[PDB]
From a paper:
MpPA14 (Marinomonas primoryensis PA14 domain) lectin is a domain of a 1.5-MDa adhesin responsible for a symbiotic bacterium-diatom interaction in Antarctica. Bioinformatic analyses indicated the presence of an ∼20-kDa domain near the C terminus of MpIBP that is a member of the PA14 family, which is a carbohydrate-binding lectin module widely distributed across several kingdoms of life. PA14 domains share a β-sandwich fold and the presence of two consecutive aspartate residues in a cis peptide linkage (DcisD). The DcisD motif coordinates a Ca2+ ion that is directly involved in binding polar vicinal hydroxyl groups of various carbohydrates.
With the C-3 hydroxyl in the axial position, allopyranose cannot bind MpPA14 via its cis vicinal 3,4-diol, as this would cause the saccharide ring to clash with residues of L11 (e.g., Gln156). Unexpectedly, the binding site of the lectin contained the furanose form of allose, with its 2,3-diol interacting with Ca1. The furanose rings lean toward L11, with their endocyclic oxygen interacting with the side chain amide group of Gln156, and the C-5 hydroxyl group extends out to hydrogen bond with the side chain hydroxyl of Ser130. At 30°C, approximately 92% of allose exists as pyranoses in solution, yet MpPA14 binding appears to be dependent on the rare presence of the allofuranose, which only makes up ∼8% of allose in solution, explaining the feeble affinity of this sugar for the lectin. Remarkably, the lectin can discern favorable conformations of these monosaccharides from their nonbinding anomers, even when the latter are much more prevalent in the equilibria (e.g., allofuranose as opposed to allopyranose).
Residue numbers in the entry: 10 to 191
The structure:
């Protein structure tokens, strides 16, 4: 049985090779078991400096969510996270606005909805809108990585045409698509 919690299933991977793009991070994910798992219940991480994969920087980055880490990973030069689960969204139009260093990819119901396929110092991108056809728990996954240096990841979502944005957190996240009461 997979645990039911109000969050996404989180996996952290570190490496001593360079992460330049999404494909490099996905290859890392596919190469081994996660270096740590966690519950991603408040997806607003960092900012910090001096490499996410070093020392206690991952704990600092994950903040509130770090108390669910399965282990304290050892040092690596580069690292990132893979998150997967469900998010409750009513039918309608939405768009992401993401602050990040380095890059990332977010997909909903299998379709990319926010992508930066390269390294970058902290930058905020307002992404194009997408539609949700039916209200309910939508499948969502996220990739984010740090190639080194500074690191931050905050993917906010608007349901009202960019007037207001919210962080994805325990109000609407579900690890399995069942309703959490936690
Ligand atoms: O590639 C752009 C560049 O600024 C990279 O160096 C870093 O320190 C920063 O966090 C970013 O990853
Ligand atoms: Ca894996
Ligand atoms: Ca560590
Ligand atoms: Ca924090
Ligand atoms: Ca906590
Ligand atoms: Ca690197
Ligand atoms: Ca960086």
């Amino acid at each position: 049985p997979d645990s039911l919690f109000a969050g996404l299933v989180g996996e952290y991977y570190g490496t001593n090779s360079q992460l330049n793009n999404i494909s490099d991070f996905r290859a890392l994910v596919d190469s081994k078991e996660a270096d740590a798992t966690f519950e991603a219940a408040n997806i607003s991480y960092g900012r910090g400096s001096s490499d996410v994969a070093k020392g206690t920087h991952l704990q600092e980055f994950l903040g509130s969510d770090a108390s669910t880490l399965s282990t304290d990973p050892g040092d690596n030069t580069d690292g990132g996270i893979y998150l997967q689960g469900y998010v409750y969204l009513e039918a309608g139009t939405y768009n992401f606005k993401v602050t990040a260093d380095d890059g990332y990819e977010i997909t909903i119901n299998g379709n990319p909805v926010a992508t930066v396929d390269n390294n970058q110092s902290v930058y905020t991108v307002t992404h194009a809108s997408f539609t949700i056809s039916e209200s309910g728990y939508q499948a969502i996954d996220m990739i984010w990585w740090d190639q080194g240096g500074d690191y931050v990841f905050q993917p906010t979502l608007s349901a009202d045409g960019g007037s207001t944005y919210f962080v994805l957190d325990s109000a609407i996240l579900s690890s399995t698509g069942e309703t959490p009461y936690t």
